[PDB]
Symmetry: C2
Subunit: 400 residues, 2 copies
């Protein structure tokens, strides 16, 4: 164990360095269900303002009942990849309902959106082709691109001038197919990508468009279809990826959605789909339930946006600087990494659970609390959180 | 457009090669007797449902209770607000079951493998792989900047050669990576020989035990238990989606330093949803159930032994040893395809594999044994296989 001990010592020193930078990630143990007021292992009840539980569906009674029913009817697991003996009728039903929900022809299910992105680019593009990425894209997009042999281009976040430049450079380089790839929502900023301008440029230069809409599906756009609906470009986004693990229920599951040809080819060749278990029947059944629950009413979306508007009003009037527009992610900009860490700790002492981010996750000097709104927050819970944030900021001499 | 035309032509080319994958629509639970959309009921001999847990009432009850106590989803990655007490409980129980210090959960073993190598190894290091390793291992290695060496399947001579080559190239850390079971052959990896070579050359060892956890070794802990090298395998990955229940979920298990570093840096763990509480709760139950009774494992190995006896005695050639995967070796791809078609006509659902999945001239039916098969069901399937083999003039 002299070589193995050298290896473990190396890792332990890396861990110690992470702790020294103030960047060590600790897990808070929740003993309750995911919801607005969670219980943690200390015994305290705290208001959760850092979940992707945007419509409060993670503990919604309709989903729990549909998950149980799905287990009674379709069992606990498939124990197979889809093409061997892992496909049930409900997998196809879910894929059809997602396709219509999103305004696309077909949908392919994965056990995560991480895998949907990882399994996309290498399957549809090769060295003859080009991928043009927004510089701020999500890590699963980055890793999918890394498996792909296509030429890679990057444009600065949300910068349509650099996107046009890179489209020209891609044309000049001889690209057969060109794919522009963007997150639909930049999740550290709460900024929705500029889909109209991207679609104009793709149409001008003959490029395909792909949007990862994980942080938008369920509540962006009138019917909650996503940012392509929000920006009225539904038929101009060629490929959409997304997750069931955020607003759409919160368990797990991801998908790719698009033209029948692309989806059929992914079923034939996408490696995560070929080599990983089919999605669990309880999750498939609950997600079918979700899509119906979301077409029944726009009530949950309405509560989400009322909360978001109220939060911006009260927090900005108290003197906080808030990032982004038109999304449930509303970061409190604090600049200094130690200040952000202290703010989160003081918020916890007042019963509010938030998470802070700093470099390298966000730029140096632009540290922030990534507050996330949720339809699960009652107006009183939301006002209690805002009250606590104001008290913390006054205690810390950040606001007057 | 040109792109959609190109894609459609690739599809057509695949259909023309006879390589197109079709999905059979199952309308029942996963079990020995499944119903397909045609309305037929068929005996399923191609699932990874090795202990019949995929529809076991205890898992369904534990999953429902897990939803009542811990909800439907976490809607968060683990480090933000995705960690429940039951996630930590499952990791501790897996750790004790596998004989390792700590365990980190992923939503699939596909992601556990993808999230492993680049997190612990870089260009100064080397990875030495068995040539037959699973695709998620290959894809995890592709994200890793370490030097790559490959040895032919199960070949300890080429492994020693590649260890020497890795030493010669100046490798700082060296990781030998193998599937625990080569899943087209039903062959258990030669862990004793690997560990000897790793000790001799100063290498770490990693085993993907996805096709073994739950039923290999005395407690079902895996191939490291089967080969009595539990403390000599440094890193173990595995899945909950095969013998351990069949829903989804994967994990990496090993020394506390490595697992902690994975929690800090493994990209699928940082950027993908925490595992759904129903699956965590059911898996906690599975780990108790499998130590409470060895009946399911016993039924599995009884079926396996009976299948090998009746099928060898009828004249079939069968691959592997000591595993639930018992391939019928048929050599010729058209013969294997016809065999699967004829078996289906008699109510048995099997899958055949041929090149590029297995070598040319070594096409096979990948029959998978299961505790879910009753003795009567297994005998009906064996009867059908023998009738098919006689109809096809493969056996007398
Ligand atoms: C060796 C090996 N690794 C990884 C996997 C992937 O398992 P999962 O379905 O959890 O992604 C499989 C199954 C496998 O056989």
């Amino acid at each position: 164990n002299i070589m193995s001990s050298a290896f473990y010592q190396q890792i332990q020193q890396q861990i110690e360095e992470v702790k020294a930078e103030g960047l060590y990630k600790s897990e808070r143990i929740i003993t309750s269900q995911q919801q607005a007021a969670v219980k943690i292992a200390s015994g305290e009840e705290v208001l959760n303002f850092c979940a992707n539980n945007y419509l409060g569906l993670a503990n919604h009674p309709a989903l729990i009942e549909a998950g149980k029913a799905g287990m009674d009817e379709h069992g606990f697991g498939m124990a197979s990849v889809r093409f061997i003996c892992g496909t049930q009728d409900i997998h196809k039903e879910l894929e059809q309902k997602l396709s219509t929900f999103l305004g696309k022809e077909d949908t392919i299910l994965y056990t995560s959106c991480f895998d949907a992105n990882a399994g996309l680019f290498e399957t549809i593009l090769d060295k003859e082709d080009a991928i043009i990425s927004d510089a701020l894209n999500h890590a699963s997009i980055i890793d999918g691109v890394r498996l792909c042999k296509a030429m890679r281009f990057r444009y600065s976040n949300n910068n349509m001038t650099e996107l046009e430049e890179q489209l020209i450079a891609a044309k000049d380089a001889g690209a057969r197919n060109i794919l522009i790839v963007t997150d639909g929502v930049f999740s550290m900023d709460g900024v929705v990508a500029n889909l109209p301008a991207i679609c104009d440029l793709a149409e001008k230069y003959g490029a395909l468009t792909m949007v990862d809409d994980s942080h938008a599906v369920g509540f962006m756009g009138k019917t909650g279809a996503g940012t392509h609906e929000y920006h009225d470009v539904v038929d101009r986004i060629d490929i959409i990826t997304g997750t069931l693990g955020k607003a759409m229920g919160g368990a797990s599951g991801g998908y790719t959605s698009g033209k029948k040809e692309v989806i059929e080819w992914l079923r034939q060749r996408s490696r995560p789909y070929l080599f990983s278990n089919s999605v669990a029947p309880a999750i498939v059944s609950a997600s079918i339930r979700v899509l119906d629950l979301l077409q029944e009413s726009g009530d949950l979306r309405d509560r989400l946006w009322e909360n978001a508007t109220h939060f911006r009003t009260r927090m900005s009037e108290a003197g906080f600087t808030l990032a982004g527009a038109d999304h449930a992610i509303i970061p409190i900009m604090l600049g200094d990494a130690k200040v952000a860490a202290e703010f989160a700790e003081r918020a916890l002492e007042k019963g509010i659970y938030v998470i802070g981010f700093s470099f390298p996750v966000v730029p140096k000097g632009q540290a922030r609390i990534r507050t996330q709104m949720s339809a699960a927050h009652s107006r009183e819970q939301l006002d209690k959180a805002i009250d606590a944030f104001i008290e913390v900021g006054r205690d810390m001499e950040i606001i007057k």
